[PDB]
């Protein structure tokens, strides 16, 4: 499947940055893993499908635009905007967020994320996926080069063919231009010359 | 500076995942500060200019050399060539190259166990985030060009080739036109002369 790893304030633990994993198999409508950790305990909770459409009609919303608020409030990085806010509750283990308008603020959602018995191996886990991943896109991203690189010299090469090829042709059809004036011009002597001819014999 | 994390496995644990983070100034040479850590606790230590140089010359290698096997052994081979060991109650952590038929103790350095092992994982996750954040940016970007300069690659040739075949064809035209202008110019020239034998 995919995930998403972000930075996330909790407003009950304000001083130090906490870590939002999201995972999901194609899509997040499917349902979805979630996690939050602070480098030292991990929490995990688990959405269901039916879960998310039962949280979608709740707030009387279309399941397909509650989905993409999910999206935006967990999946991407929280902005100057302020636009959401996150709340968890490490007692009754229940993560809450709310999404923030001018003059009125409302819960988005929430979910329960049970603490973790191993919490060190979903950090190491975590840890790994990013390690992986930039590794990934780096020999990806050399591959990407060589290719640009390559492409390039031939563009420059091309484009210089191409304008010369174009010239040719231009001077081609001026040629032929003259040339078709030219058999008319030639073969209407030859018309006058024959009338010359028939007329003095 | 400058900032490496590595994935390692420990001698005495050897399913378990560590993580080396090693951080240096402008070279390795200079010095470094080197933090271990298995997603729970965490260790650090420091190592001088002049402690690099003493281990250098109790091997009795050349400086360069060795700082080119802790760079090859601390930031970055074929599998196991270079092997980690840790105590935890003495916290000695010594590494080792693994040769054919042959193996030599590389380095050596004592890490004191730090009170705050989550704020230091804290900011190493923050770390990681960012610069996968950033590759994931580079490669996308370079594939757009990439895509982008083999698409033009393509359109290029077709235009090309589109292009010389109509340059074919007026060429050939031009030639049926060149021949026909001989001929009939002939033909005047006949006329003509046959014109002047009867004036």
């Excluded at 305990?41 to 979608?56: C, D, L, N, P």
Aim: aromatic share 8%; net charge negative; with cysteine.
């Amino acid at each position: 499947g995919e995930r998403k790893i972000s930075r996330i304030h909790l407003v009950s633990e304000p001083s130090i940055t906490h870590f939002l994993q999201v995972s999901w198999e194609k899509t997040l409508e499917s349902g979805f893993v979630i996690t939050l950790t602070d480098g030292h305990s991990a929490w995990t909770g688990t959405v269901s499908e039916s879960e998310i459409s039962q949280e979608a009609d709740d707030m009387a919303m279309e399941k397909g635009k509650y989905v993409g608020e999910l999206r935006k409030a967990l999946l991407s990085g929280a902005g100057p905007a302020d636009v959401y806010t996150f709340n968890f509750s490490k007692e009754s283990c229940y993560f809450f967020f709310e999404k923030n308008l001018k003059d009125v603020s409302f819960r988005l959602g929430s979910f329960n994320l049970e603490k973790v018995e191993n919490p060190a191996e979903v950090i190491r886990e975590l840890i790994c996926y990013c390690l992986d991943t930039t590794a990934e896109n780096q020999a990806k991203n050399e591959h990407a080069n060589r290719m640009a690189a390559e492409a390039q010299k031939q563009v420059k090469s091309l484009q210089s063919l191409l304008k010369d090829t174009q010239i040719q042709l231009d001077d081609a059809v001026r040629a032929n231009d003259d040339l078709k004036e030219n058999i008319a011009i030639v073969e209407r002597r030859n018309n006058l010359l024959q009338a010359e001819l028939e007329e003095l014999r």
